[PDB]
Amino acid sequence: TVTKPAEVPSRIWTYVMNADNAYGKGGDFALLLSAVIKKQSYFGDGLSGSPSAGDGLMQVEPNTRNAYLSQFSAKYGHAYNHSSEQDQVYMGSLILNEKIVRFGSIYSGLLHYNGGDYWYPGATDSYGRPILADQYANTVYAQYKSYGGRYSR
Numbered sequence: 001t002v003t004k005p006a007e008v009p010s011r012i013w014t015y016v017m018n019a020d021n022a023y024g025k026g027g028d029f030a031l032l033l034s035a036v037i038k039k040q041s042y043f044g045d046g047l048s049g050s051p052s053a054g055d056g057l058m059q060v061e062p063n064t065r066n067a068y069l070s071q072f073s074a075k076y077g078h079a080y081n082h083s084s085e086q087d088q089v090y091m092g093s094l095i096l097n098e099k100i101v102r103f104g105s106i107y108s109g110l111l112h113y114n115g116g117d118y119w120y121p122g123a124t125d126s127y128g129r130p131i132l133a134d135q136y137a138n139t140v141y142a143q144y145k146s147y148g149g150r151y152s153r
C-alpha cells in the first residue's frame with residue numbers, strides 16, 4: 001500500500017500523487033483521483049468528440065472552476081492555469097476533497113462532485129446532458145476499491 005495501478009499512465013500517477021501529498025492522504029486519495037480521471041476523460045484519451053472536451057482531465061465545468069479560483073490559489077500558491085494538466089488535477093482534487101469533507105463521505109463526495117450540491121434525477125449539465133450522478137458514484141467507487149482503496153469517509 002499503495003502501488004500505481006498498471007492501467008493508469010505514469011504521467012497521471014504523478015499528478016494525483018502530488019494532489020495526494022497536498023492533502024496528506026498517504027496515497028489513498030491518488031487511487032480515488034485515478035478512478036475519477038479514468039471516468040471523466042480516460043486519462044485524456046476519451047476527450048475528443050465531446051462538447052466538454054476543453055474542460056480537461058477531471059472535466060470541471062467552467063462555472064465551477066470559476067467559483068474556486070481564489071481557493072485554488074490559496075491552497076496551491078499560484079493562480080489556476082487551465083493549460084496545466086497538474087493544475088487541472090489540483091482543481092478537481094480540491095473540489096472533490098471539499099465535497100467529501102462537507103458531505104461526510106466518499107460516495108456522497110463523488111455523487112455531488114458529478115451532480116453538484118442540488119442534483120436530482122433528470123438534472124442536466126452545462127452542456128444540457130443528463131447527469132446520472134448515482135451511477136457515477138457507484139461505478140467510480142467500485143473502480144476506486146478495485147484499485148485498492150480502503151476508505152468510506
Ligand SMILES: CC(=O)N[C@@H]1[C@@H](O)[C@H](O[C@@H]2O[C@H](CO)[C@@H](O[C@@H]3O[C@H](CO)[C@@H](O[C@@H]4O[C@H](CO)[C@@H](O)[C@H](O)[C@H]4NC(C)=O)[C@H](O)[C@H]3NC(C)=O)[C@H](O)[C@H]2NC(C)=O)[C@@H](CO)O[C@H]1O
Pocket residue numbers: 039040041046047048050051052053058059060061063064065067095113114115116117118119120123124125126129130131132136
Ligand atoms: C470527455 C467527456 O465528455 N467526459 C465525460 C464527463 O464529462 C462526464 O461528466 C460530467 O462531469 C462533470 C464534473 O464531474 C459534471 O460537472 C458538474 O456539473 C454540475 C451541473 O452543472 C455542477 O453544478 C452546478 O454548479 C453551479 C455553479 O457552481 C451551481 O450554481 C449549481 O447549483 C450546480 N448545479 C446543481 C444541480 O447542483 C457541478 O459543479 C459540476 N462539477 C464539477 C466538478 O464541475 C457534469 O455534470 C458531468 N456531466 C454528465 C452528463 O455526467 C462523465 C459522466 O459520467 O462521463 C465522461 O465520459
